[PDB]
Amino acid sequence: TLSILVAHDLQRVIGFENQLPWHLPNDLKHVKKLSTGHTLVMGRKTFESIGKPLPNRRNVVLTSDTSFNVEGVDVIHSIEDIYQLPGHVFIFGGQTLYEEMIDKVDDMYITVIEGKFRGDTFFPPYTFEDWEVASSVEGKLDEKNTIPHTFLHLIRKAVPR
Numbered sequence: 001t002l003s004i005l006v007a008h009d010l011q012r013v014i015g016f017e018n019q020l021p022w023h024l025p026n027d028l029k030h031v032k033k034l035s036t037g038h039t040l041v042m043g044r045k046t047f048e049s050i051g052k053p054l055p056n057r058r059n060v061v062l063t064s065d066t067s068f069n070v071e072g073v074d075v076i077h078s079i080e081d082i083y084q085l086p087g088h089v090f091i092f093g094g095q096t097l098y099e100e101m102i103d104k105v106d107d108m109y110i111t112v113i114e115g116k117f118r119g120d121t122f123f124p125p126y127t128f129e130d131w132e133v134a135s136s137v138e139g140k141l142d143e144k145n146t147i148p149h150t151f152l153h154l155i156r157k158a159v160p161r
């Protein structure tokens, strides 16, 4: 399977100054649960922002940098390389990767952050006309998680007739 994994706000902001605009531990927990034991594909900037590989899954970084070498990280230099990765592959960001992959993925795991943040990077526009809501679950709010958010699993609709 090839899936998008992303959190975006009400205006599709995903990032600001190479960081997530929001502090929302529950979403990182969500990401962890979905991707553990599988594969994450991310652009070079997204990787540098995280700083190191995420434990207990395959970390793949797309970059044109042929000198790129990081212990625990696998490197690719082409979008086409993604299709050769075995197992469940999650497109993990950032804007460039999403733009390149949104027309190609089977489904998307989207956390809608129910707020308006300042951003400098965005998820591409999409329409629910094209995407079936396989599930929609409200995130629980509390001390550490104070921004309303919704976990969507969207699956690409087939064009019939």
Ligand SMILES: NC(=O)c1ccc[n+]([C@@H]2O[C@H](COP(=O)([O-])OP(=O)(O)OC[C@H]3O[C@@H](n4cnc5c(N)ncnc54)[C@H](OP(=O)(O)O)[C@@H]3O)[C@@H](O)[C@H]2O)c1
Binding pocket: 005, 006, 007, 008, 013, 014, 015, 016, 017, 018, 019, 020, 042, 043, 044, 045, 046, 047, 049, 062, 063, 064, 065, 077, 078, 079, 092, 093, 094, 095, 096, 097, 100, 121
């Ligand atoms: N809210 C979310 O769920 C979510 C998910 C992850 C990231 N984000 C965020 O998204 C932002 C960054 O997005 P971004 O677009 O500016 O950077 P990015 O997509 O993470 O990575 C950009 C880079 O990946 C490369 N790349 C992309 N396509 C390539 C291709 N076809 N062939 C070779 N290399 C390719 C390049 O690396 P080189 O320049 O080294 O060649 C490129 O400059 C941040 O603010 C960050 O925090 C948020």
Ligand SMILES: CCC[C@H]1c2ccccc2C=NN1C(=O)/C=C/c1cc(Cc2cnc(N)nc2N)cc(OC)c1OC
Binding pocket: 005, 006, 007, 018, 019, 020, 025, 027, 028, 029, 030, 031, 032, 033, 046, 049, 050, 054, 055, 056, 091, 092, 093, 110, 111
């Ligand atoms: C609860 C544990 C936290 C932890 C972790 C620890 C150990 C092992 C695995 C993981 C799984 N991911 N975890 C992270 O810190 C990831 C953080 C992160 C991620 C994303 C990607 C992402 C962000 N959000 C969404 N919805 N999609 C996404 N694709 C982007 C980031 O910066 C731009 C991140 O840094 C803040």
